[PDB]
Amino acid sequence: ETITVSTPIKQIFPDDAFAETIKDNLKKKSVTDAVTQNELNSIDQIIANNSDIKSVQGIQYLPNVTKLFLNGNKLTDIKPLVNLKNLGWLFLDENKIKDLSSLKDLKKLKSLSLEHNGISDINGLVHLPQLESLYLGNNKITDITVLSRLTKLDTLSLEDNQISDIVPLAGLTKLQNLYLSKNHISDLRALAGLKNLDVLELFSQEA
């Protein structure tokens, strides 16, 4: 929950790469430097793409992070994100995240990117009905039933997956930007009632 007294960054963040990320974020001299909960409370954004991070253990102590860039790492477990109540924008492309249950109570999350994670089962995304942007390109998804609950989506990429049935998108009236290239789609009837689309890409299907 909280760091009660000042503690070395090295001790809170066991992943050597993530400890260095925190050191640089707070402009500290060394991962041996001690930080207070007050200093950790000052972190609202972490930029740590392409950083060879295997674990974000310790991030639980950053209650005020709203923007988290973790594209291109070696993550499989996002349980340390479970109680980051203020997370708004989350980028996790090119990891290997399959268990999405830790996203369930991220109720301020507006944007989620999980491209190229090898995902097939997205049932757990049903618990994010407030999402506005969702990027799932380059995965192994077939069944998008649960996206019918995500009635606030305005941007959705499902390109380069295994989808043939897009009926669950029929009621997503707020969609503006929809990317469906490189799937198995022949029948777009269910999209006929979407009135607010600016972008709809359907290139290169394999029927």
Partner: nanobody, 120 residues
Framework: QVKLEESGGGSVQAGGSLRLSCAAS????????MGWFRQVEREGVAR????????WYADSVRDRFTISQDNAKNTVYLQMNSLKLEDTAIYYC????????????????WGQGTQVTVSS
Amino acid sequence: QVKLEESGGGSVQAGGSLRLSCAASGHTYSTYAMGWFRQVEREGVARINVGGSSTWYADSVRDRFTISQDNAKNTVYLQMNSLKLEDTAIYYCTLHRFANTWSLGTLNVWGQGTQVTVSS
């Protein structure tokens, strides 16, 4: 390998006008977001969906600036009218495939920047 070629800028008198251009090369996108940020921390100014029609403007420039595109030419244009002292800044062309991510800046392709100075 995405390249942003910026044209336009310099000094202008308050109340005057300036038009910036930015052309994107080396990409495959059917549609994408392109526009400008500025830095007087860097802030978004104007965005358009190249290959679509949606736009976004910062509140401070909304009705004075107009962004447009030549889709086939992969170029966007920023017509800056009724220029104000508050508009002096370095202006950066910038691009992302997805408009909502474009707004964050962090993941965008970035141009070199052009100096705009509004006097009097």
